[PDB]
């Protein structure tokens, strides 16, 4: 339908207007912090971001054309990847730090407050660092995030995957369009395109590793998790 008829500029325009807001945490820098404290803050934050992500996914050219069961599957597969790439995006201005929220800046040290989190932080830090050394643009970020949404679950009657492939090809064209405007040569466009898509492989890795640790934690019940987050998480196990 509508997604394929869109040009590159109004594809970018659609993705930028569809952007979710940056939410605030309930962090009080006067309390003590701990394992259940951080995990409690991040759980509540991510749970509110999920609601925005759902209404964001609806405005991604193409997602709506899909059946509801396919939309459920894609979000269940990519929800942590989308949260993570958003995290490393807004953490670009803060080297060595992770901006979970405008009032929540954690470094590598505070990652040790939770077991197995400090390793994932370093990967998130390295990913954020990569975007920094590469000068990631907002127009490029919204393209990558949309790619993750349509790509995560595609391989996992209806060759709706064929439609998904068509939209992905459109986003690819959009990315190339952006790099052409930035004055990059043809060789530089393909290389940058490849560099960006290879990072998607890392975001997949970080997500899968974090999903396994997000399951260690549920079993503990040290800190409860919202009904939605549990259902998103249970889709992986």
């Amino acid at each position: 339908s509508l997604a394929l008829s869109l040009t590159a500029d109004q594809m970018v325009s659609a993705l930028l207007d569809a952007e979710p807001p940056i939410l605030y945490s309930e962090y009080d820098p006067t309390r003590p912090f701990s394992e259940a404290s951080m995990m409690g803050l991040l759980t509540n934050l991510a749970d509110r971001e999920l609601v925005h992500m759902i209404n964001w996914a609806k405005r991604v050219p193409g997602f709506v054309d899909l059946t509801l069961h396919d939309q459920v599957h894609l979000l269940e597969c990519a929800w942590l990847e989308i949260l993570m790439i958003g995290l490393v995006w807004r953490s670009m201005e803060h080297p060595g730090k992770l901006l979970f929220a405008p009032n929540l800046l954690l470094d590598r040290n505070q990652g040790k407050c939770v077991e197995g989190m400090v390793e994932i932080f370093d990967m998130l830090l390295a990913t954020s660092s990569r975007f920094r050394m590469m000068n990631l643009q907002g127009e490029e970020f919204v393209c990558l995030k949309s790619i993750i949404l349509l790509n995560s679950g595609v391989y996992t009657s209806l060759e709706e995957k064929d439609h998904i492939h068509r939209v992905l090809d459109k986003i690819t064209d959009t990315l190339i369009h952006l790099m052409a405007k930035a004055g990059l040569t043809l060789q530089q466009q393909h290389q940058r395109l490849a560099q960006l898509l290879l990072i998607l492989s890392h975001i997949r890795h970080m997500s899968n590793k974090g999903m396994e640790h997000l399951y260690s934690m549920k079993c503990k019940n040290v800190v409860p998790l919202s009904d939605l987050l549990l259902e998103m998480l249970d889709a992986h196990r």
Binding site: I54, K58, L68, Q71, E76, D227, E231, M232
Partner: peptide, 10 residues
């Protein structure tokens, strides 16, 4: 399912 209903609103 929660994700089901939230996608289905409006």
């Amino acid at each position: 399912k929660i994700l089901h209903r939230l996608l289905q609103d409006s």
